[PDB]
Structures are given as C-alpha cells and as structure tokens.
Amino acid sequence: GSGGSSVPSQKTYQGSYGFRLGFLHSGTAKSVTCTYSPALNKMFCQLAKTCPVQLWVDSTPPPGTRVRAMAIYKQSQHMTEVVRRCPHHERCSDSDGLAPPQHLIRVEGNLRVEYLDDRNTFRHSVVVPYEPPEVGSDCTTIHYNYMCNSSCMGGMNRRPILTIITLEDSSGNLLGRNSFEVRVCACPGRDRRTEEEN
Amino acid sequence: PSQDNREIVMKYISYKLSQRGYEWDEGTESEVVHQTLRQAGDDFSLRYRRDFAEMSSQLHLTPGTAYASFATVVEELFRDGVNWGRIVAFFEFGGVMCVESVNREMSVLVDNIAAWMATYLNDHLHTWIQDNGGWDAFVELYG
Ligand SMILES: [Zn+2]
C-alpha cells in the first residue's frame, strides 16, 4: 500500500548530461546469471546474483551527484502497491551488514551505499554516489542484486516489476531517469529466449 | 570496556598478521564474538577491495601520519550513520593498513594503527554498539 497512492514516474529523461543505460551483451545459454533483452528492454537475473547496469553520460555530472534505484510494479492495477520482499526472504539470514532486510534491490561492492525507507511514500530505494568512469572505460558500472524471485508468493507473486534509475544531485533534485523491466527467475537465459519469441 | 574494546582490536590484528608470516602481539580461538567478526571481515576485504584501496590512497600512510588522518578516513565511512556492516569495514580497513605497512617494511606502524582503531572504537562506536544490542546482537545476525 503506497503512501497516498502517488506512483513515482517512469518517463525517460536523458536531461542535460545525456544520461542513458547500458547492459552487457551476455548471451542466453542457461549458465547465464544476468542478461538483458534489448527488444523487450527487460533484464533477466537470478536471486542475489550480480546484475551489471552501466551509466552512460555525454557530459560528466558534478560531484555530489547520486544514483538511486527503485522498483515499481509494471501493471497499472498494481502500481500503487509498494514492492517489498516476501516475508520468508525478509526473515531469512542474508544480511550484508549494509542493506536492511526488507529492501528488494541492493548494491554490492559499494561501502558508500545508502538505503532509504521513505516517510511519505513508504517506498524502498538504494543510493550510491555517482563516480566518473575509470580510466580505460567510458561508463560507470553499478552491480545490483535482487533479493526475491519474481515468483515468490506473498511478495511479487509473478507480477513483473520495473526498476527506475535516477540521477539526482545533493539536494535530491532530478537530473535524469531511465527504466527497465526485471524478471528474477531460475533460468534467465531460457526465459529470455522463451519470451524473445512469443 | 576501554580495555575490552582494546582487546578485540588487537586480536583482530594479531590474526590478520598471523595469517601471513608475521608474528605480532582458554577457549579463545572459538570465542564466538571475535570468530564471526573475523569471518565477516575476511569476506569484506574481497567485495570491497576497490573501496579499501581508495581509502588507503587517501590515508597516505607514512611514519609521520597522525591519528587525525586515520580518523578522517574512517569518519567518512560512518558519515551516514553507524551499522554493523560499516563497523566490519572499520575493522578490515585497519587490518589491511597493518598488512600494508608490514609489506612496505614499516612494521612499527602496526602499533600506531592498533592504538588508533581502539581510540576511534571507544570514542565513537562503543556507545552505538551498547545501544543496538551489543556484540551479541551482531552475532545474532552474523553481520
Ligand atoms: Zn521472495
């Protein structure tokens, strides 16, 4: 139940910095942990495994810029329900010592990670500081973990979600936004190849 | 309390240095509070190697380094609040600073790093630890 049923927006906004998302061209052989279908703009992944998402930018945002991730349900009849972990996984022992147990999206490999439980919307989000690409690279890579399967009864319950990535400044004002569908499954490569047909 | 916090730091540093060729100083190997902290810190050095490298890049460790520079680096680690994950990162960063100075043939810096960690623990983290269930609450979550 969303606070006041005020769904956060998902409209693409590349903004002043040319903010876009990139994904690894991993295949669909069933030994894939993570792979992105460009035709469906949909990422398929396994629980608690690494999902690299890249941040492409035509002009470097200033320091103090932050990158937020948030999930919402894709179907309109569910957009007002907050995406939470199933009770079983919320109670299980998988704390990384940084992420509260109820959050579904995590960032791994970042000590500066921040988790928010919004006092008005009741929605979860995870925030890290934006950093320019490393030498040799042209994009900034963030490693995400989804901590429930899409099938988990009492959580998502086979409902597709979308992740919304936003560029903010120190004050939280909007600098850019992108989004993609997420299916956390058991066989990501087989499911992408299945849906990428019919 | 102040001595109790000093001990957990030195036992943490003793084990890290002993797990390499460096020797530095009843049922203590199995003591549950320290054992799970060591296992948690061993995990942290792998996943956050990028962050620890950056932190020790900022902490330009030389014989002349004062407490204040160390405190500055670790204070940034807690700027957004204290949690068990960040406290584990506080211990493992001190460990990597100690191994780094032994490897750079500056072994006597290990004493300074050890005293700094105990100081920062007693001054800033101990009140939070006692208010959030003590070390027992840490082992209840195993992190
Ligand atoms: Zn679940």
Numbering used by the authors:
A (entry chain A): 91 to 288
B (entry chain B): 7 to 31, 86 to 203
Paper lines:
The tumor suppressor protein p53 triggers transcription-independent apoptosis through direct interactions with BCL-2 family proteins, but the molecular mechanism is not well understood. However, anti-apoptotic BCL-2 proteins antagonize the activity of pro-apoptotic proteins by canonically binding to and sequestering the BH3 domain of pro-apoptotic proteins through a large hydrophobic pocket (called the BH3-binding pocket). In this study, we present three crystal structures of p53-DBD in complex with the anti-apoptotic protein BCL-2 at resolutions of 2.3–2.7 Å. The structures show that two loops of p53-DBD penetrate directly into the BH3-binding pocket of BCL-2.
